[PDB]
Design an enzyme around this catalytic site. Structure first.
Site, PDB file in Angstrom:
ATOM      1  N   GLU A   1     106.030  42.826  14.221  1.00 21.35           N
ATOM      2  CA  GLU A   1     105.075  43.170  13.171  1.00 21.35           C
ATOM      3  C   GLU A   1     104.316  41.902  12.795  1.00 21.35           C
ATOM      4  O   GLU A   1     104.930  40.914  12.377  1.00 21.35           O
ATOM      5  CB  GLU A   1     105.766  43.760  11.940  1.00 21.35           C
ATOM      6  CG  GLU A   1     104.776  44.313  10.880  1.00 21.35           C
ATOM      7  CD  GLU A   1     104.548  43.389   9.684  1.00 21.35           C
ATOM      8  OE1 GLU A   1     105.430  43.306   8.794  1.00 21.35           O
ATOM      9  OE2 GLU A   1     103.479  42.748   9.623  1.00 21.35           O
TER      10      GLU A   1
ATOM     11  N   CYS B   1     101.689  40.779   4.411  1.00 23.89           N
ATOM     12  CA  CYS B   1     100.976  41.207   5.607  1.00 23.89           C
ATOM     13  C   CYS B   1     100.009  42.334   5.279  1.00 23.89           C
ATOM     14  O   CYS B   1      98.968  42.469   5.929  1.00 23.89           O
ATOM     15  CB  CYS B   1     101.970  41.654   6.678  1.00 23.89           C
ATOM     16  SG  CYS B   1     103.101  42.945   6.114  1.00 23.89           S
TER      17      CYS B   1
HETATM   18  N1  LIG Z   1     103.218  39.713   9.439  1.00 25.08           N
HETATM   19  C1  LIG Z   1     103.714  38.984   8.386  1.00 25.08           C
HETATM   20  O1  LIG Z   1     104.186  39.610   7.418  1.00 25.08           O
HETATM   21  C2  LIG Z   1     103.693  37.500   8.468  1.00 25.08           C
HETATM   22  C3  LIG Z   1     102.591  36.869   8.994  1.00 25.08           C
HETATM   23  N2  LIG Z   1     102.542  35.454   9.042  1.00 25.08           N
HETATM   24  C4  LIG Z   1     101.361  34.744   9.653  1.00 25.08           C
HETATM   25  O2  LIG Z   1     101.790  33.467  10.180  1.00 25.08           O
HETATM   26  C5  LIG Z   1     101.313  32.368   9.366  1.00 25.08           C
HETATM   27  C6  LIG Z   1     102.501  31.585   8.845  1.00 25.08           C
HETATM   28  O3  LIG Z   1     102.646  30.441   9.575  1.00 25.08           O
HETATM   29  P1  LIG Z   1     104.302  30.477  10.076  1.00 25.08           P
HETATM   30  O4  LIG Z   1     104.930  30.811   8.753  1.00 25.08           O
HETATM   31  O5  LIG Z   1     104.480  29.218  10.859  1.00 25.08           O
HETATM   32  O6  LIG Z   1     104.431  31.921  10.840  1.00 25.08           O
HETATM   33  P2  LIG Z   1     105.278  31.855  12.213  1.00 25.08           P
HETATM   34  O7  LIG Z   1     105.044  33.241  12.760  1.00 25.08           O
HETATM   35  O8  LIG Z   1     105.211  30.570  12.969  1.00 25.08           O
HETATM   36  O9  LIG Z   1     106.930  31.953  11.686  1.00 25.08           O
HETATM   37  C7  LIG Z   1     107.418  33.210  11.995  1.00 25.08           C
HETATM   38  C8  LIG Z   1     108.899  33.046  12.477  1.00 25.08           C
HETATM   39  O10 LIG Z   1     108.867  32.695  13.864  1.00 25.08           O
HETATM   40  C9  LIG Z   1     109.513  31.430  14.052  1.00 25.08           C
HETATM   41  N3  LIG Z   1     108.798  30.753  15.135  1.00 25.08           N
HETATM   42  C10 LIG Z   1     107.669  29.896  15.107  1.00 25.08           C
HETATM   43  N4  LIG Z   1     107.317  29.496  16.347  1.00 25.08           N
HETATM   44  C11 LIG Z   1     108.241  30.108  17.205  1.00 25.08           C
HETATM   45  C12 LIG Z   1     108.394  30.081  18.613  1.00 25.08           C
HETATM   46  N5  LIG Z   1     107.560  29.357  19.403  1.00 25.08           N
HETATM   47  N6  LIG Z   1     109.395  30.786  19.211  1.00 25.08           N
HETATM   48  C13 LIG Z   1     110.208  31.495  18.370  1.00 25.08           C
HETATM   49  N7  LIG Z   1     110.180  31.601  17.024  1.00 25.08           N
HETATM   50  C14 LIG Z   1     109.166  30.887  16.476  1.00 25.08           C
HETATM   51  C15 LIG Z   1     109.463  30.688  12.664  1.00 25.08           C
HETATM   52  O11 LIG Z   1     110.494  29.758  12.588  1.00 25.08           O
HETATM   53  C16 LIG Z   1     109.678  31.892  11.715  1.00 25.08           C
HETATM   54  O12 LIG Z   1     111.051  32.264  11.627  1.00 25.08           O
HETATM   55  C17 LIG Z   1     100.629  32.995   8.128  1.00 25.08           C
HETATM   56  O13 LIG Z   1      99.533  32.196   7.775  1.00 25.08           O
HETATM   57  C18 LIG Z   1     100.245  34.431   8.610  1.00 25.08           C
HETATM   58  O14 LIG Z   1      99.013  34.498   9.275  1.00 25.08           O
HETATM   59  C19 LIG Z   1     103.642  34.697   8.533  1.00 25.08           C
HETATM   60  C20 LIG Z   1     104.581  35.261   7.778  1.00 25.08           C
HETATM   61  C21 LIG Z   1     104.726  36.740   7.685  1.00 25.08           C
END
Ligand SMILES: NC(=O)C1=CN([C@@H]2O[C@H](COP(=O)(O)OP(=O)(O)OC[C@H]3O[C@@H](n4cnc5c(N)ncnc54)[C@H](O)[C@@H]3O)[C@@H](O)[C@H]2O)C=CC1
Ligand SMILES: Cc1cc2c(cc1C)N([C@H]1CCCS1)c1c([nH]c(=O)[nH]c1=O)N2C[C@H](O)[C@H](O)[C@H](O)COP(=O)(O)OP(=O)(O)OC[C@H]1O[C@@H](n2cnc3c(N)ncnc32)[C@H](O)[C@@H]1O
Length: 1216
Positions: free
Chosen positions: A794, A828
């Site tokens: 998601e 989101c």
């Molecule tokens: N769909 C939603 O509800 C969400 C959307 N976002 C989006 O992402 C941005 C946030 O930046 P982040 O918080 O850094 O989101 P991110 O998507 O990098 O973090 C999401 C999760 O994935 C992990 N992650 C990061 N890189 C990874 C990789 N290469 N392989 C595996 N796991 C990995 C992070 O540690 C965290 O647990 C926001 O600005 C927004 O656009 C972030 C949070 C929630």
């Protein structure tokens, strides 16, 4: 650095014994409230007989004098259908918007009556819900504008100018003389002379309510002030009992009138009310404070107390105060008021009403999951309460002035005889509503009747203004239980009408039992599962208990460690800081080494058979126990989420509720579905975000666990502490340590887990970019069975709301402010692009900017904070760079100023950016940043295209009253979660199953019935998951197959046609006042990568049976297998040499051996755009297994939530 929660929600004043007795009754069980009321309301047999005779006499008078509504006579005279009557009144309303009376007459004669009324006169039918009430007595939430247009055309072509003239005159009488006493206070005063000479008095309501901006609050203030002058001038020394008064609504006088903003209410609203009261004092007129929603009751008492104790107001007894008898606190509020009257020496005017917000209170308590309702649920209970409370007031006429506001002849008679034989003007009075109570009270006022005075509540305002309280009054009057509906109802006898509610309640089997057809909030879902319980932040006891529990949560040494199967692991340790104030250390996290992440997956693989062996119901029992623990621990969990994730108390409550709901929902879904043949995938990597660090974290993990899989839980690096607490609760509820391992750390830990060889599935919520990186890593891999590794991702949205000129601006603004800036826009589902129809864009934008500046931004350990920080400095920098770029391109940017105290954390001010084109926005900006565009009505369909064009498809909002616009927009928009006439955030588990399409994710929806099936190797049949509809192109394809001799594939095609759930169309149980729909549609264009002719036919049958079109890989060389398709099937089929050029796709079906599946899977992962849910099978699997391609993953889930209270009331609940 202020101590955490030291100033969370201090009360305005220490709660006295009398105040505490009020709060204690707030949600008292209904069976406990009634017995003292029954006893207080009991009168002697002689009194009861006398009261029935008086009530009978009044009703015979009412039914005896001229009925026959003007509208009814107009419908009769011209043989109008209901829709023609409504359409005609809408036309009259529009014609009256033309001021020049002669200009209107020429339009009627020369253009309207002659033909095309459309060509001249914003839909004509914006207010048809109100006129529908006038015409039919029934309330419809939205307007069938095509039906009304047809009826208006029909009636004009049939009857021409005469019927139009009769309609104009009829509306003129209703809107100028019946719904309001007058359009202005000076006009209302003129028209009040007639009945004042007959013994009536008046109280004027400047129809004004719910300020959303400071400017609107100031406008309402100057309206009240000028009305007080005009009433006081006309009163001319008659005094507060014989002379007229004014009624005000506190919500009109301040845009943030709520307990959460109590300091601003006392600092800013109170001086305004004092200034108006000082004016009423100088003229010696009554000033009455109207009662509003239940969560404003006790806050209003604080204002009443200060005002009554303010010496500047001494010498005047005109201050008045409404109390609502349908409220459980009413008798205890009266005790407080009567005591305040004694202390102050002021004879407080107490208007006793039943209550105007019943529908809304039922809905609100259900939504908030509170313990019970703050109002009664049987109408007869309110009547007993009213009569009981009248007895209390009549015993205190020396210190208060009781005002019995009611149109119920039985209620009147009981009080009339209760009051006894001694009367003098000023002892008490009755009250009624203009244009509604005069029939009854003409039988009351004057020496020749009952010789008791009646004050008429006189609404004042223009036609535009009046179309709000008009719905409430017409709906309350037309409810099946309302006295004024029953007296007009010929099947209802006078014996029924004079039946004593006190004796009917007393004789019931269980006194005070809740209404049978209304669910307590905890029982919303019936036998399926227990609703999560919320917390009432308007309840002083709750706030006091929560203050203590929040402080204690901030004293705790929260930690998060790598929690492997074997025990805690060592690693690098660092502090976790409050994003609202980096000086506030929340806890310590020990992060996971890459080696230990790989080790965790191996231990999960080793443990998987033992966890899979736990029977599904026992796995469910662990979830249900964890839900119980989270419910019990909610106050502590709140405090952690507030400080670790920068969330407000309100949003933290909703988050904990959501985690509880996930656990209980997946437990129930498990008990409904899972058996031995639904084997687990194996170790599942759950990667979660920081913005819902407990709810989304718990949801993904619970679903994987209860589906029989061991879990590697990788929380966001920003929020490990609440994750560690969630794992601790889950382990305490019985999840073995080997089935649930916690690996705190950054994306490097996430990636090590995803890459580990035994990883059998991944659940990811976060950015699209990371999901795409995960997909690419998984594309290289196959399960032991040689099938792709499932990814549930998601990934957020570019969410829009479309507002047309029929929407109510104040509703829109409240829903926009909430959707865009709640949680600092870090949902989101947050509203990113507001689309305003051009003719209302300026007014709405003005109110929106005004409402923006009423938001309080700061560290979230204070109830008064509306918007907290963004999660990190990097997020803050990203968001601010977008704002400045927009500003640099010349876009209008509105921003609230931030207090200096925000410097210690990472805050972004809520921001409004005006764009020219939706194409100006080229990326999801995950912050409190609302973009606004405007559109011409004829371009609506193009705008829906523009919204779809972003490629996202999560949440979407529509504000409109017009059925044609609803049908148009909701059939063309491509989003997973639709919301009609409400905000677009806070989807509820099992009610709005949550998840989108396109760039917004893969599905299936979290909190929905297809979720668990993705986490097992053989998907079960979900509850209610079936459809009687058969795709007609599928059927055409099956006949084509039989024609080509492909008999077996033809049979398999027909089987897929039957198995498909395409067209499922369900309503899900939820709160009253809302309709929550769940439907299965085609996904779109499915990429087909076949290997054999038979494989292609099975793939094509699967895609068509689920409503999809296809793009077939031309490299398969199978073009000769589809010669001479029927055009219906041909229309759905294309051939693709360059897959990336013919996208986007919505899914993929692959045929081949393990090596071919891996190659295709890698190529598919490289396609730009959406992550595709890919299904793969060998040729042999296709021949052996009819479910080789599962049809669950070839349809698209859509949730739609429609606010059916939006027109001003709950029609279904009014028949209750
Ligand atoms: N769909 C939603 O509800 C969400 C959307 N976002 C989006 O992402 C941005 C946030 O930046 P982040 O918080 O850094 O989101 P991110 O998507 O990098 O973090 C999401 C999760 O994935 C992990 N992650 C990061 N890189 C990874 C990789 N290469 N392989 C595996 N796991 C990995 C992070 O540690 C965290 O647990 C926001 O600005 C927004 O656009 C972030 C949070 C929630
Ligand atoms: C005459 C009058 C009325 C009001 C006011 C002034 C004057 C002069 N002010 C006004 C200021 C702003 C709003 S209007 C006022 C009001 N209201 C308010 O909240 N604040 C206010 O300030 N009202 C509206 C009353 O509260 C009430 O809704 C209405 O008068 C119907 O009561 P009745 O004539 O006894 O009918 P009746 O005997 O029919 O009773 C109708 C009432 O029963 C109640 N009811 C219906 N179904 C129920 C159920 N299933 N369970 C429990 N109760 C149920 C409900 O309160 C409903 O209005």
């Amino acid at each position: 650095a202020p101590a955490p929660f030291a100033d969370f929600a201090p009360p305005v004043r220490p709660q006295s014994t009398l105040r505490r007795a009020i709060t204690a009754a707030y949600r008292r069980p209904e069976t406990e409230c009634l017995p003292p009321l029954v006893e207080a309301a009991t009168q002697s047999k002689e009194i009861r007989d006398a009261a029935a005779s008086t009530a009978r006499k009044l009703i015979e008078a009412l039914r005896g004098k001229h009925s026959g509504s003007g509208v009814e006579g107009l419908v009769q005279e011209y043989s109008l259908s209901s829709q023609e009557g409504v359409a005609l009144m809408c036309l009259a309303e529009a014609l009256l918007r033309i001021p020049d009376t002669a200009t209107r007459d020429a339009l009627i004669r020369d253009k309207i009556a002659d033909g095309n009324w459309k060509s001249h006169l914003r839909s004509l039918f914006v207010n048809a819900a109100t006129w529908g009430l006038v015409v039919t007595g029934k309330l419809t939430s939205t307007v069938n504008d095509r039906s009304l247009a047809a009826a208006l055309t029909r009636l004009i072509s049939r009857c021409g100018e005469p019927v139009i003239r009769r309609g104009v005159d009829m509306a003129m009488r209703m809107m100028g003389e019946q719904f309001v006493t007058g359009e202005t206070i000076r006009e209302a005063l003129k028209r009040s002379k007639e009945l004042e000479e007959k013994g009536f008095s008046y109280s004027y309501d400047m129809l004004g309510e719910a300020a959303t901006t400071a400017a609107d609050a100031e406008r309402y203030y100057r309206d009240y002030e000028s009305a007080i002058h005009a009433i006081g001038k006309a009163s001319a020394g008659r005094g507060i009992y014989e002379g007229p008064g004014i009624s005000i609504k506190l919500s009109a006088l301040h845009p943030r009138y709520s307990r959460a903003q109590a300091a601003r209410v006392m600092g800013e609203l109170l001086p305004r009310v004092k200034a108006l009261a000082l004016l009423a004092k100088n003229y010696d007129i009554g000033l009455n404070i109207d009662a509003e929603e239940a969560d404003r009751l006790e806050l209003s008492l604080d204002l009443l107390e200060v005002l009554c104790l303010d010496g500047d107001l001494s010498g005047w007894n005109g201050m008045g105060f409404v109390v609502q008898a349908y409220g459980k606190r009413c008798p205890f509020v009266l005790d407080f008021i009567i005591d305040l009257a004694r202390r102050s020496g002021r004879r407080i005017m107490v208007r006793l009403v039943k209550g105007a917000y019943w529908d809304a209170e039922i809905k609100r308590a259900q939504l908030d999951g509170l313990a019970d309702f703050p109002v009664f649920t049987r109408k007869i209970h309110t009547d007993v309460s009213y009569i009981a409370c009248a007895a209390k007031l009549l015993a205190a006429t020396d210190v208060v002035f009781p005002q019995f506001a009611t149109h119920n002849a039985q209620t009147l008679a009981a009080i009339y005889h209760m009051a006894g034989k001694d009367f003098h003007v000023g002892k008490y009075e009755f009250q009624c509503l203009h244009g509604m109570g005069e029939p009854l009270y003409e039988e009351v006022v004057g020496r020749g009747k009952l010789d008791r005075p009646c004050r008429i509540y006189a609404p004042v305002g223009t036609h535009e203004t009046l179309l709000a309280y008009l719905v409430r009054r017409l709906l309350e009057n037309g409810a099946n239980s309302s006295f004024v509906h029953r007296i007009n109802d010929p099947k209802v006898s006078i014996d029924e009408l004079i039946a004593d509610p006190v004796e009917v309640v007393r004789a019931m089997p269980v006194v005070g039992a809740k209404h049978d057809r209304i669910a307590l909030p905890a029982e919303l879902f019936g036998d399926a599962r227990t609703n999560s319980a919320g917390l009432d932040l308007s309840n002083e006891e709750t706030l006091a208990s929560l203050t203590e529990a929040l402080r204690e949560s901030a004293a705790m040494k929260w930690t998060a460690l790598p929690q492997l199967a074997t025990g805690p692991a060592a690693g690098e340790t660092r502090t976790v800081l409050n994003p609202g104030d980096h000086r506030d250390v929340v806890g310590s996290v020990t992060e996971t080494s890459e080696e230990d992440a790989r080790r965790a997956v191996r231990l999960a693989a080793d443990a998987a058979p033992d966890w899979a062996a736990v029977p599904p119901s026992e796995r469910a029992a662990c979830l249900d126990r964890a839900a119980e623990l989270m419910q019990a621990r909610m106050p502590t969990l709140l405090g952690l989420i507030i400080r670790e994730a920068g969330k407000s108390a309100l949003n933290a409550i909703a988050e904990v509720r959501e985690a509880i709901d996930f656990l209980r929902y997946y437990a129930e879904q498990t008990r409904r579905t899972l058996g031995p043949g639904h084997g687990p995938l194996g170790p599942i990597v759950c990667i979660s975000p920081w913005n819902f660090p407990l709810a989304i974290f718990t949801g993904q993990i619970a679903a994987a666990l209860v589906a029989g899989n061991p879990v590697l839980a990788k929380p966001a690096e920003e929020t490990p502490l609440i994750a560690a607490e969630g794992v601790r609760i889950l382990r305490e509820a019985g999840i073995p340590a080997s089935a649930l391992q916690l690996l705190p750390g950054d994306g490097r830990v996430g990636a090590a887990l995803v890459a580990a060889a035994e990883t059998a599935g991944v659940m990811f919520t976060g950015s699209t970019e990371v999901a795409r990186l995960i997909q690419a890593q998984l594309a290289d891999r196959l399960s032991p069975a040689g099938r792709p590794i499932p990814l549930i991702a998601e990934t957020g949205g570019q969410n829009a709301m479309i507002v047309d000129s029929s929407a109510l601006a104040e509703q829109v603004v409240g829903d926009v402010i909430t959707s865009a800036f709640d949680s600092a826009g870090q949902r989101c589902s947050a509203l990113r692009v507001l689309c305003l129809q051009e003719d209302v864009a300026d007014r709405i934008l003005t109110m929106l900017k005004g409402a923006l500046h009423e938001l309080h931004i700061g560290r979230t350990d204070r109830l008064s904070v509306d918007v907290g920080p963004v999660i990190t400095s990097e997020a803050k920098d990203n968001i601010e760079k977008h704002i400045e770029r927009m500003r640099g391109l010349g876009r209008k940017v509105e921003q609230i100023g931030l207090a200096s105290e925000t410097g210690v954390g990472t805050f972004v001010p809520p921001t409004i950016i005006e764009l020219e084109k939706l194409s100006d926005l080229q990326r999801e900006v995950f912050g409190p940043v609302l973009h606004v565009i405007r559109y011409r009505r004829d371009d609506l369909d193009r705008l829906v295209d523009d919204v779809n064009a972003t490629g996202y498809g999560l949440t979407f909002g529509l504000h409109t009253r017009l059925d044609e616009t609803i049908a148009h927009v909701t059939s063309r928009i491509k989003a997973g979660n639709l919301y009609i006439n409400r905000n677009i955030i806070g989807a509820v588990v099992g009610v709005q199953p949550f998840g989108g399409r396109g760039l917004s994710g893969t599905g299936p929806k979290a909190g929905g019935p297809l979720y668990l099936g993705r986490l097992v190797t053989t998907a079960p049949v979900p509850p209610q998951h079936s459809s009687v509809h058969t795709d007609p192109v599928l059927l055409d394809f099956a006949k084509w197959l039989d024609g080509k001799g492909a008999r077996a594939e033809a049979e398999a095609a027909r089987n897929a046609g039957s198995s498909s759930a395409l067209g499922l169309d369900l309503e899900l149980p939820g709160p009253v006042g809302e309709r929550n729909l769940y439907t299965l549609h085609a996904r779109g264009r499915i990429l087909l990568v076949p290997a054999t002719e038979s494989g292609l036919y099975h793939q094509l049958a699967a895609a068509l049976a689920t409503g999809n079109s296809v793009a077939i890989d031309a490299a398969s060389g199978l073009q000769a297998s589809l010669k001479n398709l029927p055009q219906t099937v041909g229309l759905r089929v294309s051939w693709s040499k360059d897959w990336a050029a013919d996208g986007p796709f919505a899914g993929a079906l692959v045929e081949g051996d393990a090596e071919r599946i891996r190659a295709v899977n890698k190529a598919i992962a490289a396609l730009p755009g959406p992550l595709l849910l890919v299904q793969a099978a060998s040729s042999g699997e296709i021949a052996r297994n009819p479910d080789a391609y599962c049809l669950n993953w070839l349809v698209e889930e859509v949730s739609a939530s429609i606010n059916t209270a939006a027109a001003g009331g709950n029609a279904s609940l009014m028949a209750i």
